[PDB]
């Protein structure tokens, strides 16, 4: 009994319903499960690559190709590029077809529900913006695939190191190519993302030589970014922004003074709960169906 996911958090008082929901419990449990899975490992870790993972990468490559086929247009506005709406319309019409390439035929009934999260994972057409809510929708998308058994426990490392990693590459391409606005202050973690800082800091726990203080060292980032998701995010920032790190990324600057990656990871998880998952402007757009339901969490 699959259900097309719909919005359920309509006003601020509804946040209580969200925090008590099955969806919330399942979502954060998924994030933390992937977090444990990647602990201490480099991106070059030798993991299983299942058929489903390959199809998910192919899916992202299709989105990538569409960007190439949909160049920015000349326009007066100094914010988001209107060609994004052309790209999004293609994804909007093709999302179910794309998801059907990943989901086995006997689970075709789940495709429309799962596809909704894909449609919510790539930014907002109207505002031409992207935020942690879209990133969360992608995690939700992957969570749904685990729930219906398309992705298995053995795929959890590949989910982060291969699929989510590729997703971030495509999102960065969207953000740069279409000049997308951040959807969301001096204490904001990042313009666009959050999850890669959590899973990335997990990779670096008990690292033999890299400490959090090293991520504001351009040399350290340049020499190590290929192995570490956290450092790849920093590299993106230092390419997108000018001047002293403390000026353009104050929250991350202060995080570099945390003595251990272990505490960075713990703190980022607390920040994620408070600044993403308990933030009404983000959660109001979360969609709930059968796989991630709004009903109170079961015991």
């Amino acid at each position: 009994n699959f259900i097309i996911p719909k919005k359920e958090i309509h006003t601020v008082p509804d946040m209580g319903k969200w925090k008590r929901s099955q969806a919330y419990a399942d979502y954060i449990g998924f994030i933390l499960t992937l977090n444990e899975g990647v602990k201490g490992k480099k991106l070059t870790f030798e993991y299983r690559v299942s058929e489903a993972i390959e199809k998910l990468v192919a899916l992202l490559n299709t989105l990538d190709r569409w960007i190439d086929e949909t160049p920015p247009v000349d326009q007066p506005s100094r914010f988001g590029n209107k060609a994004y709406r052309t790209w999004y319309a293609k994804l909007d019409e093709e999302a179910e077809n794309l998801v059907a390439t990943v989901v086995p035929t006997h689970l075709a009934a789940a495709v429309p529900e799962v596809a909704v999260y894909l449609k919510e994972s790539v930014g907002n057409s109207t505002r031409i913006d992207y935020g942690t809510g879209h990133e969360a929708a992608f995690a939700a998308f992957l969570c749904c695939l685990c729930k219906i058994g398309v992705l298995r426990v053995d795929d959890q490392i590949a989910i982060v190191f291969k699929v989510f990693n590729r997703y971030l590459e495509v999102m960065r391409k969207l953000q740069k190519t279409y000049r997308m606005e951040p959807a969301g202050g001096v204490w904001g973690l990042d313009d666009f993302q959050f999850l890669p800082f959590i899973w990335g800091s997990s990779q670096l726990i008990d690292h033999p030589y890299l400490e959090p203080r090293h991520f504001v060292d351009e040399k350290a980032v340049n020499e190590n970014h290929k192995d570490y998701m956290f450092l790849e995010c920093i590299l993106f920032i230092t390419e997108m922004k000018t001047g002293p790190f403390a000026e353009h990324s104050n929250q991350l600057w202060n995080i570099s003074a945390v003595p251990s990656w272990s505490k960075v990871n713990q703190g980022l998880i607390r920040m994620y709960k408070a600044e993403c998952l308990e933030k009404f402007p983000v959660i109001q757009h979360f969609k709930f169906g059968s796989l991630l339901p709004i009903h109170p969490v079961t015991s």
């Binding site: 945390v258 505490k263 920040m271 408070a274």
Partner: peptide, 5 residues
Amino acid sequence: PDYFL
């Protein structure tokens, strides 16, 4: 500013 205590 206080998530890392």
